[PDB]
Amino acid sequence: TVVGIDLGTTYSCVGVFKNGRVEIIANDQGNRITPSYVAFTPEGERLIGDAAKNQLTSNPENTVFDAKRLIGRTWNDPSVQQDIKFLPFKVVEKKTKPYIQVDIGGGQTKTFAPEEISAMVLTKMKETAEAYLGKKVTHAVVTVPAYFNDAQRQATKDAGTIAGLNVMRIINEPTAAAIAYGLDKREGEKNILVFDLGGGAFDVSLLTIDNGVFEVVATNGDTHLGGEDFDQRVMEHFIKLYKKKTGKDVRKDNRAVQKLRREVEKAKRALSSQHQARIEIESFFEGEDFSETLTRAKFEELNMDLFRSTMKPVQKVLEDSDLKKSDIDEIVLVGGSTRIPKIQQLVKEFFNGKEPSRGINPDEAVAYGAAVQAGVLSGDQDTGDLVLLDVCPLTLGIETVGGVMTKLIPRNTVVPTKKSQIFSTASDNQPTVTIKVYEGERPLTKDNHLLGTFDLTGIPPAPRGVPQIEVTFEIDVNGILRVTAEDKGTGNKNKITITNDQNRLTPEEIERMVNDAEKF
Ligand SMILES: Nc1ncnc2c1ncn2[C@@H]1O[C@H](COP(=O)(O)OP(=O)(O)O)[C@@H](O)[C@H]1O
């Protein structure tokens, strides 16, 4: 049995399709969602989920969360460096990547890739399913944000592999939510706008849905905008307010900062139905108390630029799809941050008063869709006929003379897809040709994201411009790039091997990580 797993920034959820419906599976504490948290106690045990989250404020330095905000990123990514200020665990550079360093008891230290932390969360979700089903789970569909880049997708797949899962399919969050919405609808072709604002990432997708055929027409998002940022804006407001009023800087006392996080999260949720919320921390800093009242007005003001920025991807999607606001037949709100009244108001006002679709739990819609997809890919016959056409989120291009982004595969192209191009040499007997591939929509590569540098190696001695090497760029159904090369010269064909600077986790490295995880 293939399971569907929503691997979320703040929570994870696992479901299965059985006897013609989705079951969202409860964990050992009876909760249908599990916090995406891992902790290491001084006594040496590894805690996952609710038990890990519950000791955050007493053991903050060795409690890990928000790994999805770091996964597949490089060390000098501004979103990594900005998030470090709010995370209690040490983040250290290794392999040009942010690794997580913790104490595991007995004066001992261990360093983990974000992939490894997410693999521990996936392992717990797998075990939750295995307890319910009474048998081993080896295959899964796993969710990612629609706007995840190549590295973020591959790193999520690698987390699955470390957790002992054959990840059959990576599914984009809004597409999963669309399946939850539109499964078994036999209505005419409808244009559906999915507005997906979770704990860490924001996606907008426009889909056509017509009797089981789902097509993503356009997508745009922000992989570092979500509920965690709304908490962190309020946290920073109070850290600064405390220093102004007392002269004391609490930003290094991890217990203080994470007690503030706990209280802000509680207040934020309260402010979705109340207009005021009391923040109370007994023993905030140096044994002294902290009491403040947060109004809905103040919460909104502190975050208004972030809230208003969610309209930017909405307009980008309408422009790419060539649709007007009035062509949108349904608005599907998904992600727990869509519970914020101001977000609902901004979306409603953008679409001139149109109400969102009812009957959809924004916290569970993504997991529901992943479970359906898992059932379909298994070969189940009690699901509806599901046909999915999804897209690549980012234009792929190659750097050419003058730092120019020369487009190869445009954004919003249905995957899988491929493009080929012939390369040659600039100098006599040149043995290697380098190709830099970028992701993004700006005309200069310095303003886009480097996907990787690829070296065509083993080019046999020849005069300049004579070699003819056909390089193929294929984006698979998961949204991940593979680059291959073939010699198209006349006479003796030579093997052209490609090397890259992506620093993929190798099977050797994954095996080591599997063995390291079993020690807990
Ligand atoms: N009533 C609420 N008001 C405001 N924010 C909420 C509410 N309920 C949940 N959230 C936020 O939703 C985010 C989590 O969204 P969810 O979709 O459940 O999980 P994930 O994004 O981790 O997959 C968190 O940032 C949480 O604070």
User: Residue by residue, what is the 3-state secondary structure of 93-160?
Assistant: EECCEEEEEEECCCCCEEEECHHHHHHHHHHHHHHHHHHHHCCCCCEEEEEECCCCCHHHHHHHHHHH
Whether residue 342 sits in one domain with residue 266: no
Cβ atoms within 10 Å, residue 293: 11
Whether residue 154 sits in one domain with residue 78: yes
Distance from C-alpha of 155 to C-alpha of 68, rounded to nearest angstrom: 10
415 alpha carbon, distance to own chain's centre? 19
Q: Is 363 in the pocket of ligand 1 (CB under 6 A)?
A: yes
Ligand 1 centroid, distance to 192 Cα (angstroms): 22
What is 228-242 written as a DSSP string? HHHHHHHHHHHHHHH
**Residue 234 domain flag:** yes
Distance from C-alpha of 342 to C-alpha of 197, rounded to nearest angstrom: 13
DSSP 505: P
Please tell me which residue in 68, 97, 126, 157 is annotated as part of the active site: 68
The CB-side HSE value for 500 (13 A sphere, CA atoms) comes to 18
> 472 near 481, Cβ under 8 Å?
no
Burial track 493-513 (b if 16+ CB lie within 10 A, e otherwise): eeebebeeebeebeeebbeeb
CATH number at residue 286: 3.90.640.10
Whether residue 205 sits in one domain with residue 181: no
Whether residue 176 sits in one domain with residue 158: yes
Say which residue the tokens 């349904």 belong to.
330
74 alpha carbon, distance to own chain's centre? 15
Whether residue 350 sits in one domain with residue 209: yes
Distance from C-alpha of 449 to C-alpha of 441, rounded to nearest angstrom: 10
Whether residue 458 sits in one domain with residue 348: no
Distance from C-alpha of 145 to C-alpha of 97, rounded to nearest angstrom: 20
Cβ atoms within 10 Å, residue 306: 16
H helix intervals, 322-458:
341-350, 365-378
Whether residue 283 sits in one domain with residue 266: yes
Q: Give resolution, Å, one decimal.
A: 1.6
CATH number at residue 416: 2.60.34.10
Residue 242: what residue type?
Y
Q: Is 145 in the pocket of ligand 1 (CB under 6 A)?
A: no
Q: Is 336 in the pocket of ligand 1 (CB under 6 A)?
A: yes
Ligand 1 centroid, distance to 364 Cα (angstroms): 11
Token pair in block for residue 16: 């299965």
Closest CA to 473 of 435, 444, 503, 501: 435
Whether residue 273 sits in one domain with residue 193: no
Distance from C-alpha of 35 to C-alpha of 118, rounded to nearest angstrom: 12
Kindly give the number of the ligand 1 atom that is closest to the alpha carbon of 336.
12
Whether residue 179 sits in one domain with residue 137: yes
Give me the sheet containing 190-197, strands edge to edge: 330-334, 190-197, 202-210, 213-222, 387-389
Distance from C-alpha of 320 to C-alpha of 342, rounded to nearest angstrom: 26
CATH number at residue 154: 3.30.420.40
Distances (CA, A) of 45 to 89, 90, 107, 168, 519: 17, 19, 14, 31, 10
* Residue 24 phi, psi dihedral angles, 5° rounding: -85, 125
Whether residue 230 sits in one domain with residue 134: no
Question: What CA dihedral angle connects 149, 155, 161 and 164, to 10 degrees?
Answer: -110
Domain residue limits at 212: 186-225+310-360
Give me the sheet containing 37-40, strands edge to edge: 46-48, 37-40, 63-65
Distance from C-alpha of 329 to C-alpha of 133, rounded to nearest angstrom: 38
Based on the residue annotation, tell me whether 6 is a catalytic residue of this protein: yes
Whether residue 330 sits in one domain with residue 452: no
Whether residue 323 sits in one domain with residue 176: no
